[PDB]
């Protein structure tokens, strides 16, 4: 509905958790967002804000659940 692009503050929160989880846009999150939202998303900046808030919730669950194994 709202196609407002992802804002910088939300992007930064996402980047922070990706780093903490030792995950990346290219290898991990852009493929998953493309699958879940059923569209070709080639760059982090192409997410809508509404899409990014759902991705952020997921990453928070991953970072809260357990330690990141070395």
């Amino acid at each position: 509905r709202d196609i407002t692009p992802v804002n910088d503050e939300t992007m930064q929160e996402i980047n922070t958790l990706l780093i903490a989880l030792d995950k990346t846009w290219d290898d991990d999150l852009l493929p998953l967002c493309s699958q879940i939202f059923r569209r070709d998303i080639r760059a982090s900046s192409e997410l809508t804000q509404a899409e990014a808030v759902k991705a952020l919730g997921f990453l928070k669950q991953k970072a809260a659940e357990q330690k990141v194994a070395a």
Binding site: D28, L32, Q35, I36, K54, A55, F58, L59, K62
Partner: peptide, 10 residues
Amino acid sequence: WMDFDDDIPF
């Protein structure tokens, strides 16, 4: 469908 509320591996 898979969505971001699910217990998905990452």
